[PDB]
């Protein structure tokens, strides 16, 4: 590897995630199709799960972007189910230390998925196993 490639890729992905979120939120508020997360979640998740990238992704606050992608859309609907499932999986995969959970606030949206009665059974169960897993790492 050229030594700069990891950080370059990590930085580029953070920017891309922020850009997609902002574009989908603006389209949603304008009552237009907002399919940016749908179309990019799979390739972005491949990046987020790359072991060589984990420390720099986490160091640059990628959890803030993963939280934003999971959060309600401006009309209060939730992001499409594939996003909810793929990003929960990403989160289960990453080795995340408690302080990064704290600064990012990503536990709050995962906790919501775990108690949301309108959520699918499989997503709600995955969120619950994530809350438990993170709670075990915290204490």
């Amino acid at each position: 590897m050229d030594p700069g490639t990891v950080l370059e890729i990590s930085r580029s992905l953070k920017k891309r995630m922020q850009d997609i979120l902002k574009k989908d939120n603006a389209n949603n508020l304008e009552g237009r199709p907002a399919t940016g997360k749908i179309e990019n979640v799979e390739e972005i998740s491949d990046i987020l799960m790359s072991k060589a990238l984990q420390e720099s992704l986490l160091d640059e606050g990628i959890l803030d972007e993963i939280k934003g992608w999971l959060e309600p859309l401006p009309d209060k609907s939730m992001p499409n189910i594939k996003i909810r499932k793929r990003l929960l999986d990403v989160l289960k995969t990453m080795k995340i230390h408690k302080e990064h959970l704290v600064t990012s606030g990503v536990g709050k949206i995962v906790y919501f998925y775990s108690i949301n009665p309108k959520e699918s059974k499989e997503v709600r169960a995955s969120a619950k196993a994530l809350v438990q897993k993170w709670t075990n790492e915290v204490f």
């Binding site: 209060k76 408690k98 536990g107 709050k108 995962v110 906790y111 919501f112 949301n116 009665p117 993170w134």
Partner: peptide
């Protein structure tokens, strides 16, 4: 616990 996961009120407006 609430520091990491909140109270569960943060997104309730959704329901």
């Amino acid at each position: 616990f609430f520091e990491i996961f909140g109270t569960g009120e943060e997104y309730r407006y959704v329901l």
